Enzyme design. Structure first.
Site, mmCIF file in Angstrom:
data_model
loop_
_atom_site.group_PDB
_atom_site.id
_atom_site.type_symbol
_atom_site.label_atom_id
_atom_site.label_comp_id
_atom_site.label_asym_id
_atom_site.label_seq_id
_atom_site.Cartn_x
_atom_site.Cartn_y
_atom_site.Cartn_z
ATOM 1 N N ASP B 9 -30.800 -27.066 20.315
ATOM 2 C CA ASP B 9 -29.809 -26.028 20.532
ATOM 3 C C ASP B 9 -29.257 -25.584 19.177
ATOM 4 O O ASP B 9 -28.459 -26.297 18.558
ATOM 5 C CB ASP B 9 -28.676 -26.530 21.441
ATOM 6 C CG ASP B 9 -27.514 -25.540 21.540
ATOM 7 O OD1 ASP B 9 -27.749 -24.308 21.569
ATOM 8 O OD2 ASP B 9 -26.354 -25.999 21.595
ATOM 9 N N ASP B 108 -28.069 -20.012 24.590
ATOM 10 C CA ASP B 108 -27.295 -21.183 25.018
ATOM 11 C C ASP B 108 -26.635 -20.983 26.391
ATOM 12 O O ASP B 108 -26.604 -21.905 27.211
ATOM 13 C CB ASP B 108 -26.268 -21.612 23.955
ATOM 14 C CG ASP B 108 -25.300 -20.494 23.548
ATOM 15 O OD1 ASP B 108 -25.577 -19.294 23.773
ATOM 16 O OD2 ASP B 108 -24.252 -20.836 22.968
ATOM 17 N N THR B 131 -18.418 -22.723 18.729
ATOM 18 C CA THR B 131 -18.005 -21.836 17.641
ATOM 19 C C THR B 131 -17.212 -20.683 18.235
ATOM 20 O O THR B 131 -16.115 -20.363 17.763
ATOM 21 C CB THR B 131 -19.238 -21.307 16.859
ATOM 22 O OG1 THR B 131 -19.996 -22.423 16.383
ATOM 23 C CG2 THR B 131 -18.821 -20.458 15.669
HETATM 24 N N1 LIG Z 1 -15.489 -24.168 7.421
HETATM 25 C C1 LIG Z 1 -15.482 -25.254 8.238
HETATM 26 N N2 LIG Z 1 -15.002 -26.443 7.805
HETATM 27 C C2 LIG Z 1 -14.979 -27.537 8.591
HETATM 28 N N3 LIG Z 1 -15.422 -27.550 9.861
HETATM 29 C C3 LIG Z 1 -15.934 -26.432 10.430
HETATM 30 C C4 LIG Z 1 -15.998 -25.191 9.633
HETATM 31 N N4 LIG Z 1 -16.533 -24.248 10.434
HETATM 32 C C5 LIG Z 1 -16.796 -24.833 11.631
HETATM 33 N N5 LIG Z 1 -16.446 -26.137 11.628
HETATM 34 C C6 LIG Z 1 -16.569 -27.080 12.768
HETATM 35 O O1 LIG Z 1 -17.595 -26.688 13.692
HETATM 36 C C7 LIG Z 1 -17.079 -26.653 15.030
HETATM 37 C C8 LIG Z 1 -17.817 -25.643 15.904
HETATM 38 O O2 LIG Z 1 -19.181 -26.061 16.048
HETATM 39 P P1 LIG Z 1 -19.841 -26.547 17.448
HETATM 40 O O3 LIG Z 1 -18.715 -26.965 18.366
HETATM 41 O O4 LIG Z 1 -20.953 -27.523 17.164
HETATM 42 O O5 LIG Z 1 -20.494 -25.192 18.038
HETATM 43 P P2 LIG Z 1 -21.968 -24.575 17.744
HETATM 44 O O6 LIG Z 1 -22.897 -25.400 18.604
HETATM 45 O O7 LIG Z 1 -21.776 -23.159 18.233
HETATM 46 O O8 LIG Z 1 -22.257 -24.654 16.258
HETATM 47 C C9 LIG Z 1 -15.603 -26.339 14.844
HETATM 48 O O9 LIG Z 1 -14.789 -26.820 15.921
HETATM 49 C C10 LIG Z 1 -15.254 -27.007 13.524
HETATM 50 O O10 LIG Z 1 -14.711 -28.324 13.702
HETATM 51 C C1 LIG Z 2 -21.257 -16.097 22.158
HETATM 52 C C2 LIG Z 2 -22.236 -16.977 21.436
HETATM 53 C C3 LIG Z 2 -21.994 -16.727 19.956
HETATM 54 C C4 LIG Z 2 -21.878 -18.379 21.886
HETATM 55 O O1 LIG Z 2 -22.558 -19.363 21.177
HETATM 56 C C5 LIG Z 2 -23.695 -16.694 21.798
HETATM 57 O O2 LIG Z 2 -24.012 -17.039 23.110
HETATM 58 C C6 LIG Z 2 -24.248 -15.344 21.473
HETATM 59 O O3 LIG Z 2 -24.614 -15.092 20.306
HETATM 60 N N1 LIG Z 2 -24.338 -14.541 22.387
HETATM 61 C C7 LIG Z 2 -24.804 -13.188 22.476
HETATM 62 C C8 LIG Z 2 -23.751 -12.385 23.207
HETATM 63 C C9 LIG Z 2 -23.814 -12.485 24.694
HETATM 64 O O4 LIG Z 2 -24.072 -13.507 25.241
HETATM 65 O O5 LIG Z 2 -23.636 -11.512 25.325
#
Ligand SMILES: Nc1ncnc2c1ncn2[C@@H]1O[C@H](COP(=O)(O)OP(=O)(O)O)[C@@H](O)[C@H]1O
Ligand SMILES: CC(C)(CO)[C@@H](O)C(=O)NCCC(=O)O
Ligand SMILES: Nc1ncnc2c1ncn2[C@@H]1O[C@H](COP(=O)(O)OP(=O)(O)O)[C@@H](O)[C@H]1O
Ligand SMILES: CC(C)(CO)[C@@H](O)C(=O)NCCC(=O)O
Lengths: 248, 248
Positions: B9, B108, B131
């Site tokens: 993922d 996702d 994110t």
């Molecule tokens: N600049 C940064 N510094 C520290 N931690 C960060 C930063 N940017 C993002 N993160 C961490 O990454 C997390 C989001 O990532 P995550 O939950 O794994 O989602 P994804 O799977 O979309 O990457 C945030 O909650 C944060 O804790």
């Molecule tokens: C919203 C995020 C960023 C969540 O990870 C992702 O699913 C994405 O890039 N989506 C495209 C926008 C949509 O789902 O309509």
């Protein structure tokens, strides 16, 4: 007489400039805050806006949440008016500051509360929608603290810049239960969501402190005006506070 | 036999790597996504984590919301395993995609909806906190759309970077009605606020489609799960979607 007062609200993206002769009716303008801007630049921007009113100014009052911008305002005031500006901050008097560090609360919030207590009463909740969206609680003339959330634009911009696939979506409330495309998904999430977030925070305040009037303000309040139950809408609340703090 | 599959993922901040031999139990690891990362760099990162299980992988399934990373995942699969990865995409079949452009919905979210319909039921509401925070509506095995909001960190970071005065606050729920300092203000607005935003969107969905069961997933869901009403908590939902989509 009715001396003219310049009232300034320096925010992170925009700066509001207002003139008044009674502290009740205001003429206002708005300019970008502008990182490297000078006192001459600011005078130059204001010249064709204020017109003749420019030379009538006898007092300058400022709330500012951008410290770097302060020496610029200071120099503008001294160079063009030979006066120092009066700076809005939390001090003892009409408002009691019941938070851990009152000097840390944003000048815009200080102004909002002062305006509220002078004009609307001892009890109320202020929602200010700008770059950030702010919630302020006033109870029996005492400021109790609040909440800070990202503003509508800050949110859509953060999604745009912080992801690969998301576009920058215009700020516009959803009139649907679920979004059927990406833009509709973000509108629902940011705008409708932020309203729910605000109403939820407000609801919890009301169950501890009872029913209190809600006043809405800020540049971004217009778009969602009908979506939040409020007793008062006053787009001039911050500028009014700057007037009351500085010029009574 | 029980062939081992690698499930990936690819998120905007973090990429999840998981191995399974049955599609019921998952060993999982997490890495930063990494803009300029190569296939050899990916391999080098995974080598001490996967150990000897690396040699046993027979298929690679991927959900990705970062298009630029895709070339790197493809090269990793081909160079090290001599296979092409299977990409999660909205297609017809077990799920109907009842939105304007199905090919635009994040992989996702597709994986989440595939995992749910396959594993949990025909009707539901999926909340993925990453994110960005996603809300997904499934009615009668049909995907109806949703909402997108900034995630918790996206919010606190946007407030930090978008203002002069605000600090970077740690993501932690507020246990108070109103914040008494700046950090508490932001925590209440962001963490509690976003919970309220979700409860409103969900409540409004349930008004039109009935009491649908709610599923919580995503790396940021743990800190907030005792604040949101949910019937399912499944941190493996996306990865389960990758497996079911790709490997049946
Ligand atoms: N600049 C940064 N510094 C520290 N931690 C960060 C930063 N940017 C993002 N993160 C961490 O990454 C997390 C989001 O990532 P995550 O939950 O794994 O989602 P994804 O799977 O979309 O990457 C945030 O909650 C944060 O804790
Ligand atoms: C919203 C995020 C960023 C969540 O990870 C992702 O699913 C994405 O890039 N989506 C495209 C926008 C949509 O789902 O309509
Ligand atoms: N990068 C940007 N591009 C376009 N418009 C922006 C940008 N940043 C902020 N804005 C606009 O500025 C306004 C937010 O500032 P404002 O409401 O004046 O709050 P403040 O008084 O705290 O600066 C919003 O109306 C938003 O649309
Ligand atoms: C929250 C903002 C950014 C709103 O403009 C401002 O009020 C501010 O800089 N505040 C300082 C932090 C505080 O009010 O506690």
């Amino acid at each position: 007489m009715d001396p003219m007062y310049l009232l300034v609200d320096v925010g992170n993206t925009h700066s509001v400039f207002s003139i008044t002769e009674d502290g009740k009716t205001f003429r206002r303008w708005r300019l970008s805050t502008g990182v490297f801007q000078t006192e001459d630049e600011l005078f130059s921007h204001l010249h064709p806006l204020l017109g003749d009113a420019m030379r009538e100014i006898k007092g300058i009052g400022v709330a500012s949440v951008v410290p770097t911008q302060n020496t610029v305002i200071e120099r503008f005031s001294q160079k063009y008016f030979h006066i120092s500006p009066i700076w809005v901050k939390a001090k003892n008097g009409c408002v009691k500051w019941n938070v851990k560090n009152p000097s840390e609360v944003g000048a815009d919030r200080v102004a909002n509360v002062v305006a509220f207590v002078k004009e609307y009463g001892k009890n109320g909740i202020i929602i200010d929608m700008g770059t950030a969206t702010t919630v302020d609680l006033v109870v029996n003339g005492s400021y109790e603290g609040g909440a800070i959330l990202p503003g509508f634009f800050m949110m859509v911009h953060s999604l745009f810049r912080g992801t690969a696939k998301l576009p920058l979506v215009e700020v516009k409330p959803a009139d649907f239960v679920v979004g059927k495309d990406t833009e509709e998904n973000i509108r629902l999430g940011v705008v409708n969501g932020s309203v729910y977030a605000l109403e939820g925070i407000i609801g919890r305040i009301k169950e501890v402190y009872g029913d209190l009037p809600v006043v809405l303000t800020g540049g971004q309040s217009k778009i969602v005006k009908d979506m939040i139950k409020h007793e008062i809408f006053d787009e001039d609340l911050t500028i009014k506070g700057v007037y009351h703090f500085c010029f009574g």
